[PDB]
Coordinates of C-alpha atoms in Angstrom, one line a residue:
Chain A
X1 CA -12.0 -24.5 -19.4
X2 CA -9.8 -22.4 -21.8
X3 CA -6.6 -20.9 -20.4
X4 CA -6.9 -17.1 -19.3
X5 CA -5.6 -13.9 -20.3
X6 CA -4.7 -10.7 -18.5
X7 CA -4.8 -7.6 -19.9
Chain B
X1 CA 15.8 -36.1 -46.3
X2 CA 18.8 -35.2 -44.1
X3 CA 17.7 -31.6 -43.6
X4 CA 14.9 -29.5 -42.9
X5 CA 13.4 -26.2 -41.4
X6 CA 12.0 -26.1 -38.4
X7 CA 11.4 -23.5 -35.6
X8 CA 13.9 -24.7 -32.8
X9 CA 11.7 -23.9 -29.7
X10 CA 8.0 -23.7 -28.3
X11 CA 6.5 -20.5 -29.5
X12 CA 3.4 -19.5 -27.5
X13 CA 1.9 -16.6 -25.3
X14 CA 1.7 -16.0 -21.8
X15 CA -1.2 -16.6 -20.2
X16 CA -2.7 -16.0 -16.4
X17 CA 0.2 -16.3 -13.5
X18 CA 3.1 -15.6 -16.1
X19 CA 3.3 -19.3 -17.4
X20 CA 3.9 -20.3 -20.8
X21 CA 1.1 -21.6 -23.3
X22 CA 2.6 -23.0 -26.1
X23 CA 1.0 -22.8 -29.7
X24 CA 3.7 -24.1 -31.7
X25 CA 5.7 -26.9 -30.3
X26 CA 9.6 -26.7 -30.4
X27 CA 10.7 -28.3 -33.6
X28 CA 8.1 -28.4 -35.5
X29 CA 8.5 -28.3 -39.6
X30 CA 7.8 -25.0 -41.1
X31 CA 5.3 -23.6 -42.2
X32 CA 2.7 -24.3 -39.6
X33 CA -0.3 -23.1 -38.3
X34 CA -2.1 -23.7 -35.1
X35 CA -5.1 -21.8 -33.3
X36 CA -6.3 -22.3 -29.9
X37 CA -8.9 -20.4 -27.8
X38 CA -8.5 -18.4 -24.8
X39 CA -10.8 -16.0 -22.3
X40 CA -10.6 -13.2 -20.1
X41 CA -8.8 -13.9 -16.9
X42 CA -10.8 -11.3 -15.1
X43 CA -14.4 -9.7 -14.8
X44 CA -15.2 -7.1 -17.0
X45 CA -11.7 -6.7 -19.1
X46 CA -11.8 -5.1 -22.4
X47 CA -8.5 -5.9 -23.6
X48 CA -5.7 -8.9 -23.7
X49 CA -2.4 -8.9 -23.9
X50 CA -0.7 -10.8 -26.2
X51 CA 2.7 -11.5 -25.2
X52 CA 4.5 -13.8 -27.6
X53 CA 7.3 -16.0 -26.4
X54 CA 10.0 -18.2 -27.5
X55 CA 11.4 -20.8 -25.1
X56 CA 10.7 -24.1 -23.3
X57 CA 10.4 -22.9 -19.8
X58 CA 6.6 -22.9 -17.4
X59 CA 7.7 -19.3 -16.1
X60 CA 6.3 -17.1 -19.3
X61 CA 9.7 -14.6 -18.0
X62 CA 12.2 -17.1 -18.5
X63 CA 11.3 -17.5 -22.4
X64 CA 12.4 -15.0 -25.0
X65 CA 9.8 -12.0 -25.5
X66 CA 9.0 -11.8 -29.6
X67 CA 6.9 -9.2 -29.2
X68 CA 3.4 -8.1 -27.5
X69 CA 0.2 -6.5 -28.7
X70 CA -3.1 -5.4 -26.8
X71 CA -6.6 -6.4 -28.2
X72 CA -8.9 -3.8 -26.9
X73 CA -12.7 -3.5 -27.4
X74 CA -14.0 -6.6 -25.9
X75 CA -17.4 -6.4 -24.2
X76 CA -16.9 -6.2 -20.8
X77 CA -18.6 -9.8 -19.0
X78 CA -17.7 -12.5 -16.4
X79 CA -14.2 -14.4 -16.7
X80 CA -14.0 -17.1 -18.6
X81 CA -17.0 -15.9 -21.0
X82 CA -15.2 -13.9 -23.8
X83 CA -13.7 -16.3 -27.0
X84 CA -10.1 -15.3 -28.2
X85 CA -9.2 -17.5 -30.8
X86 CA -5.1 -16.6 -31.0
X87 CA -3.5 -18.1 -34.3
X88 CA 0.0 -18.4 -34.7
X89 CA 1.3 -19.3 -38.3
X90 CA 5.0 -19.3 -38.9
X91 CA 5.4 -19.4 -43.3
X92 CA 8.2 -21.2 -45.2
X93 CA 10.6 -18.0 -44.7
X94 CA 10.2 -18.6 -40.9
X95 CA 8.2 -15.3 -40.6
X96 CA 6.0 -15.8 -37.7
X97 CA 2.6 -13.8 -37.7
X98 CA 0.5 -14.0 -34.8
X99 CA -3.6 -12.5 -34.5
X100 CA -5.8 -12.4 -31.9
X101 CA -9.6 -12.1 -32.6
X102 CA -12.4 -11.5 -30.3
X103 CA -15.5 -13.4 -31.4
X104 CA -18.3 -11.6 -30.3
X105 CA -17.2 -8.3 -31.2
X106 CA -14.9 -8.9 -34.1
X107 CA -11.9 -7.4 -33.3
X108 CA -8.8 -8.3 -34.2
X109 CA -5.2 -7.5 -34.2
X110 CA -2.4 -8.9 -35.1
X111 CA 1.4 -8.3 -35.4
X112 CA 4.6 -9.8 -38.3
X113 CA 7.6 -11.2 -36.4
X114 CA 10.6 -11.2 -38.4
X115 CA 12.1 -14.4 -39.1
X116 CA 15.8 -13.3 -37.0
X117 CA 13.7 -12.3 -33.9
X118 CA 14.6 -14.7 -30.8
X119 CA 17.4 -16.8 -29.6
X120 CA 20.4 -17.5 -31.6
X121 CA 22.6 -20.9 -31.9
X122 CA 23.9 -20.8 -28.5
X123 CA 20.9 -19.3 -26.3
X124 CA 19.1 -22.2 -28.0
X125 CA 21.1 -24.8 -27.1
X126 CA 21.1 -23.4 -23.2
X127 CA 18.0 -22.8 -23.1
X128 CA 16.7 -26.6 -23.9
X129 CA 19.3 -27.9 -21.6
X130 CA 18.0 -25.3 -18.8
X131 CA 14.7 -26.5 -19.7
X132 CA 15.7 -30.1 -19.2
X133 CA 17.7 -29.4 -16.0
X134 CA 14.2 -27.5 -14.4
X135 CA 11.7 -30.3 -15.8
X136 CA 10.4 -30.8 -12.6
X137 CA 11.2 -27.6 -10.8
X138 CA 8.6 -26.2 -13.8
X139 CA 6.1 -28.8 -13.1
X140 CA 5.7 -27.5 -9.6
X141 CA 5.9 -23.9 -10.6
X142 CA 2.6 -24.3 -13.1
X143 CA 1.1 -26.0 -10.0
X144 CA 1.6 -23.0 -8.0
X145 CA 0.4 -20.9 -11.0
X146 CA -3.1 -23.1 -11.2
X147 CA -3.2 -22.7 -7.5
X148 CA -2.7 -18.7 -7.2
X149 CA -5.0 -18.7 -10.4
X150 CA -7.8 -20.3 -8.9
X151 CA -6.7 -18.3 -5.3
X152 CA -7.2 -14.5 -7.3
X153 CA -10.3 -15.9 -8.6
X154 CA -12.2 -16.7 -4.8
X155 CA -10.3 -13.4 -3.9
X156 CA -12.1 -11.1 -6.5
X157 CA -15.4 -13.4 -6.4
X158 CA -16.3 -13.0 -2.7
X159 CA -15.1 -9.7 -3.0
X160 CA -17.8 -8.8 -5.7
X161 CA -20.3 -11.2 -3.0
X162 CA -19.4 -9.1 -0.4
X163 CA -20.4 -6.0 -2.0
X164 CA -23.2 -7.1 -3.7
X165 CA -24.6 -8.9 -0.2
X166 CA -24.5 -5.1 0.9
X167 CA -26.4 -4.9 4.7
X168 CA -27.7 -8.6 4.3
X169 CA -24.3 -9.8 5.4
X170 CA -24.3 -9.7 9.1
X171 CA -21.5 -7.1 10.5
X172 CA -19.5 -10.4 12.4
X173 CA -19.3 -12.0 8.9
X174 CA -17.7 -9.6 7.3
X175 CA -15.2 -8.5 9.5
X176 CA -14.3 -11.8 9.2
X177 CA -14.6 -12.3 5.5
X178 CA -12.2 -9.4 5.4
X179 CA -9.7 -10.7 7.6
X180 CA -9.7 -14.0 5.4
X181 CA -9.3 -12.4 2.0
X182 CA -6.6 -10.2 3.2
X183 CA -5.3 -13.6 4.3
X184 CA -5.1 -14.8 1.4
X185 CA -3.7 -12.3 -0.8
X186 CA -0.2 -12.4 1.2
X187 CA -0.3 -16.1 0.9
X188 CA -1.0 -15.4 -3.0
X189 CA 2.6 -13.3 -3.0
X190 CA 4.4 -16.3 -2.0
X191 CA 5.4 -19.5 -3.6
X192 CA 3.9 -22.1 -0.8
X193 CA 0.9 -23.9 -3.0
X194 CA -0.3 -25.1 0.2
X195 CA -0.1 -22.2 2.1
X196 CA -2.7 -20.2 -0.8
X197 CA -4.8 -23.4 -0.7
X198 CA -5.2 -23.2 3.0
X199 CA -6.0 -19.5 3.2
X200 CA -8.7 -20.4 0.2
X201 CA -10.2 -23.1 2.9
X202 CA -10.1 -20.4 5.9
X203 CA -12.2 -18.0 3.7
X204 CA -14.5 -20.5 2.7
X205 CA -14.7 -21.5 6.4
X206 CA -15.8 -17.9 7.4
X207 CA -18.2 -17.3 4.3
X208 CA -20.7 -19.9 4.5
X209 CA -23.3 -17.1 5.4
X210 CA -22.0 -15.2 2.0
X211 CA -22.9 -17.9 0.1
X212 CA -26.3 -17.9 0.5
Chain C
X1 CA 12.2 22.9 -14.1
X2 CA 9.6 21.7 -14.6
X3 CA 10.5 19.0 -17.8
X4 CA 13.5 16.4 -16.9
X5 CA 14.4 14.0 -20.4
X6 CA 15.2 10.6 -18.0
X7 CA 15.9 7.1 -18.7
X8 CA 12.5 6.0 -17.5
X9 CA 13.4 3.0 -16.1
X10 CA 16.5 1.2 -14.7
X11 CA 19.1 0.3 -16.3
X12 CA 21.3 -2.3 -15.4
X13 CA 22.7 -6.2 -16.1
X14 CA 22.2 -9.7 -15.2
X15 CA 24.4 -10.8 -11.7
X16 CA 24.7 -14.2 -10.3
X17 CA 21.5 -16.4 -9.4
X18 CA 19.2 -14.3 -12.5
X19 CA 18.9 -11.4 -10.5
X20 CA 18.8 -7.4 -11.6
X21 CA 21.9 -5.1 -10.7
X22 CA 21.1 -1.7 -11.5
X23 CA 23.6 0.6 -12.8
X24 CA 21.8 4.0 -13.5
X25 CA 18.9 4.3 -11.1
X26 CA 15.1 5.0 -12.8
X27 CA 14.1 8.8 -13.9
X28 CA 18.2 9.8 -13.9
X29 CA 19.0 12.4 -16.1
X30 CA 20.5 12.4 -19.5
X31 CA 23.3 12.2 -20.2
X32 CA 25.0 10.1 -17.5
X33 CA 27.4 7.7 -16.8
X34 CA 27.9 5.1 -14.5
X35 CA 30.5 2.4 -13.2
X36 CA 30.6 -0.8 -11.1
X37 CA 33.0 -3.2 -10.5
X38 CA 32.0 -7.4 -10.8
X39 CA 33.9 -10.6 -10.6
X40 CA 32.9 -13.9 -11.8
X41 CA 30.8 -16.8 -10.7
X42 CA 32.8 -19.6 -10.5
X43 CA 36.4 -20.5 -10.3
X44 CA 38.7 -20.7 -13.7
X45 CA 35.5 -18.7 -15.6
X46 CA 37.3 -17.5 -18.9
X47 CA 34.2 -15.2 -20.1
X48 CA 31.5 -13.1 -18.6
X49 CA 28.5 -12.3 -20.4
X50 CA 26.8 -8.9 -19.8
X51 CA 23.1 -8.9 -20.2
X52 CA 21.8 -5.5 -20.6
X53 CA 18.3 -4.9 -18.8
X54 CA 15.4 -2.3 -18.7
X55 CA 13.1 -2.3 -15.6
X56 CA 12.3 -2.1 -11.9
X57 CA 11.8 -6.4 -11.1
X58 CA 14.6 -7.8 -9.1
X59 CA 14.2 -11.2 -10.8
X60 CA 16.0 -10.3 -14.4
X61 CA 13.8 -12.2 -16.5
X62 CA 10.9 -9.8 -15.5
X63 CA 12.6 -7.1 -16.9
X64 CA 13.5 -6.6 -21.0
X65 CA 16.5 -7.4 -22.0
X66 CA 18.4 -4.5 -24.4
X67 CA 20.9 -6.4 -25.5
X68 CA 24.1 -9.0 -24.5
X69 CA 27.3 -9.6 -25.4
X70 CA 30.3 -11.4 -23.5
X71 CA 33.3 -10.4 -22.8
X72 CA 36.1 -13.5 -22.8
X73 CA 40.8 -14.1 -22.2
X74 CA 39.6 -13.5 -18.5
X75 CA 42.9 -15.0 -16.9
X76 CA 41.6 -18.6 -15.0
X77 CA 41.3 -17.8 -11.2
X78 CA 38.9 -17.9 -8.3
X79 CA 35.4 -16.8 -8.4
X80 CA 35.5 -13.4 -7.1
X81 CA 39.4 -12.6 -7.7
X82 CA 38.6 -10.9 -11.4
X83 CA 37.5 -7.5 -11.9
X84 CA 35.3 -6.4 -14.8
X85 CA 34.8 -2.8 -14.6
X86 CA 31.0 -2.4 -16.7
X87 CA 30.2 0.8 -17.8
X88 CA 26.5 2.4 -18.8
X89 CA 26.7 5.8 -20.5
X90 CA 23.5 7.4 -22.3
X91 CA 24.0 10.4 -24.1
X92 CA 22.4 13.2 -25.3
X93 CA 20.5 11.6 -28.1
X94 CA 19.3 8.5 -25.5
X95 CA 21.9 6.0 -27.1
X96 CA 23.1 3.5 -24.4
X97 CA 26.8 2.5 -24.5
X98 CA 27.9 -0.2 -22.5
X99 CA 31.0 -1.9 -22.1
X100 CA 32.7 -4.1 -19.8
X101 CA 36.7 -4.1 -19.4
X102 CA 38.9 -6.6 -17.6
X103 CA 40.5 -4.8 -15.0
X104 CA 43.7 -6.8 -15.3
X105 CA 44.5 -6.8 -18.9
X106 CA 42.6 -3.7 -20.1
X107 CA 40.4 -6.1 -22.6
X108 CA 36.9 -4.7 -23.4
X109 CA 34.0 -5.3 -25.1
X110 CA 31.4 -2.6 -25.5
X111 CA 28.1 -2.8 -27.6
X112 CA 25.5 0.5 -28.3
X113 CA 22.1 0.4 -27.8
X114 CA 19.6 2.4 -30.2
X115 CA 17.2 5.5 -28.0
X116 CA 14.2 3.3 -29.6
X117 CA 15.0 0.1 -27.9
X118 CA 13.0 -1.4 -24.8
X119 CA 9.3 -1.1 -23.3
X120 CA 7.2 1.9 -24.7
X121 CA 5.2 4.6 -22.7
X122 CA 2.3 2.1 -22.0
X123 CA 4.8 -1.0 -20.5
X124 CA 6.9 1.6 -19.0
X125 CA 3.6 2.3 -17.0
X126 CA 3.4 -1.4 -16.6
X127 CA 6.5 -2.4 -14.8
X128 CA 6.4 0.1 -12.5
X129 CA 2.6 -0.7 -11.3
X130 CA 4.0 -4.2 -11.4
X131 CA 7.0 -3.8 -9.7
X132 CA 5.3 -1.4 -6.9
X133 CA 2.4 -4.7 -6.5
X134 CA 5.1 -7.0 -6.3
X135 CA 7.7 -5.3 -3.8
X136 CA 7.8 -7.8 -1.1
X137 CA 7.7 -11.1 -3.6
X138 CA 10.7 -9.6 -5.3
X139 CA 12.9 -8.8 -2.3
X140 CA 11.7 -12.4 -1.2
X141 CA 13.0 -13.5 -4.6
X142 CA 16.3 -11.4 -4.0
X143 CA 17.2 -13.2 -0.4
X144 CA 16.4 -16.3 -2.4
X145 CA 18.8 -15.8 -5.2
X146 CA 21.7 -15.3 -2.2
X147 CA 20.6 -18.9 -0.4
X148 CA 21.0 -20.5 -4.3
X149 CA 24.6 -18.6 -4.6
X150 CA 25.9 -19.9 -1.4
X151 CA 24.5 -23.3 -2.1
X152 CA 25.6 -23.4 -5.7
X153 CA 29.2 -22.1 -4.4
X154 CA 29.3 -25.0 -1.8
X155 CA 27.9 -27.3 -4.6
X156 CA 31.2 -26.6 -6.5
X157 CA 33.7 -26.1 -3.4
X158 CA 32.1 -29.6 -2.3
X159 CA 32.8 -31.6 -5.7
X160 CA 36.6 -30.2 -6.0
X161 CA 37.0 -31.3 -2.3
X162 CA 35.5 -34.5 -3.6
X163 CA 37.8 -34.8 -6.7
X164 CA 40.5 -33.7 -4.3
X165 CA 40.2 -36.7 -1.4
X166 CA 40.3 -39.3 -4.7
X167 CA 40.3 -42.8 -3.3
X168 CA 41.0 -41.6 -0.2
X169 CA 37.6 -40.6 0.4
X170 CA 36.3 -43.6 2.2
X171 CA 33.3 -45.2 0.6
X172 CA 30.7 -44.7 2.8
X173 CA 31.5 -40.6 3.3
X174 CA 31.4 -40.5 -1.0
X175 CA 27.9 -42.1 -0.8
X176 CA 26.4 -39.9 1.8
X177 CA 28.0 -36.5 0.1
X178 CA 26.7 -37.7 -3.1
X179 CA 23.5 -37.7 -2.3
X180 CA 23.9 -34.8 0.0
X181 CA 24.9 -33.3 -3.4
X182 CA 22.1 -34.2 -5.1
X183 CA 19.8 -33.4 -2.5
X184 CA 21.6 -29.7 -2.6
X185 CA 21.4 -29.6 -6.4
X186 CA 17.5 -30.3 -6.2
X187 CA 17.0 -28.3 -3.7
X188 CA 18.5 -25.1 -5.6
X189 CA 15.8 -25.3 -8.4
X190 CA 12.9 -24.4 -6.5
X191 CA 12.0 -21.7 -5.1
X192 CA 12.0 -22.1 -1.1
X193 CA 14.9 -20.5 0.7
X194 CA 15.0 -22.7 3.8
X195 CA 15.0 -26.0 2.2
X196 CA 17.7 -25.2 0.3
X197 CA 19.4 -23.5 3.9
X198 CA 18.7 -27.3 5.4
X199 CA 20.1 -29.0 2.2
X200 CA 23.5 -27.1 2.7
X201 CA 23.4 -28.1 6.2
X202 CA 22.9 -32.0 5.5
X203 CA 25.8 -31.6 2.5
X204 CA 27.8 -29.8 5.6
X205 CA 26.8 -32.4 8.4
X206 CA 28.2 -35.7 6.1
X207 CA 31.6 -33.5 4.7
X208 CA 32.8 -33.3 8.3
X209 CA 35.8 -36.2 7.9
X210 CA 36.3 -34.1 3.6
X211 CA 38.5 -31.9 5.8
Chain D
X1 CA 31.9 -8.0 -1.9
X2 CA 31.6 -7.6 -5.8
X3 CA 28.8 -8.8 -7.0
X4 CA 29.5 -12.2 -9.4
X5 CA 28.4 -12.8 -13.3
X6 CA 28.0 -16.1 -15.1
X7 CA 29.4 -16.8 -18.9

């Protein structure tokens, strides 16, 4: 899975 | 040759937990280009944060900050479903320019990072000996990371379960289910990768009913 | 009043073990100044570097650094026998002056730090969200970081004892403090409190005979 | 006690 981002 | 430019550490962004993705590997010949892809971390977000780093270390706080940008406007849909693609090319001046771009909608932003931004001669050094020093220390902290990662995401899933289960969840469940994710989140405060992974396994235990 | 001009965060420096000591408190006033007295590390420490810091996390590296400089000819002595007097000051206009002076010798070293610099309106928001989520972790983080001093103190007491005994020490008590040592040192760079607590008392347990 | 700095 692709890495994650918060925001 | 005896000499050439090269950016002297990783360069990367911080991604979900605070940990350190790296784009651009530490010494690497400039210029240089890379891309890579990235989602949303959470249902329904309409922005990222790009937070760009310098450093060799798992814990994204431990590098140097270059700067940070937001990229708002993204449809709101399920984790994992949005496409970033981040892109961070560094040209033969050493300026480093970073953009973000969300596929389905288009928008992008982007930011110029001057070529003196970051560590200097002597942070550098320290920082890939501190790096060496914590190899394994690092290691176990992106563990945790991928571990509270994968915790927040049951958390906020059986959460959204819960409430969409509404009255179909028997009364006895859900006090328990409750219980359980409250559980969890304390053990998600603390740095014990077992610990979050046996609170996941006690809410599991008292959700079997929720997942149907 | 009803409109204060604050420092909208905290102000402080970098102590021992990466953690955040405060020198002017969040939302203070403008101007204002402030003092505290520090010492060093580690015995024989000739410098200390000063590493300015905006924010509310007790682990330093969560906050944003404004700034460093170091401040060196500290006379060699003890850990904690020195006294660097650091000084924040903002003025009128939001410039930051900080300096730190050797209380001995009267050497300083002072840098100034633009109104602009650090987190904006919308980070400012940020870290205080962030540090209200994460109150417990950091004070966790905080009784961590004075485990790792003591450890890393008795680390360093343990190896001059250790240099100290010279062939004296007797083989067997050199191998079992080494390894105690290491055990300690590995110990120190993760992040649970009582295994580093047990690691000082197996480094104590085998350095009984060391006095 | 005074609280310690590296360097």
């Amino acid at each position: 899975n692709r890495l994650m981002l918060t925001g | 040759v005896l000499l050439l430019d090269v950016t002297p550490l990783s360069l990367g962004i911080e991604t979900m937990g605070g940990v350190m993705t790296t784009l651009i590997a530490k010494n690497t010949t400039i210029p240089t280009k890379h891309s890579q892809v990235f989602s949303t971390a959470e249902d329904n977000q309409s922005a990222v944060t790009i937070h760009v780093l310098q450093g060799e270390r798992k814990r994204a706080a431990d590098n140097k900050s270059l700067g940070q940008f937001n990229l708002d406007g993204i449809n709101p849909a399920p984790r994992g479903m949005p496409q970033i693609e981040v892109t961070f090319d560094i040209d033969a001046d050493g300026i480093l320019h970073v953009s973000a771009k969300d596929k389905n909608s288009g928008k992008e932003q982007k930011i110029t990072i001057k070529a003196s931004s970051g560590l200097n001669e002597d942070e550098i050094q320290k920082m890939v000996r501190d790096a060496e020093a914590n190899a394994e220390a690092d290691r176990k902290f992106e563990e945790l990371v991928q571990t509270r990662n994968q915790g927040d995401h049951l958390l906020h899933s059986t959460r959204k379960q819960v409430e969409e289960a509404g009255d179909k969840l028997p009364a006895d469940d859900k006090t328990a289910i409750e219980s359980a994710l409250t559980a969890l989140e304390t053990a998600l405060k603390g740095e014990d990768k077992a610990a979050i992974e046996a609170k996941m396994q006690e809410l599991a235990q008292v959700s079997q009913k929720l997942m149907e």
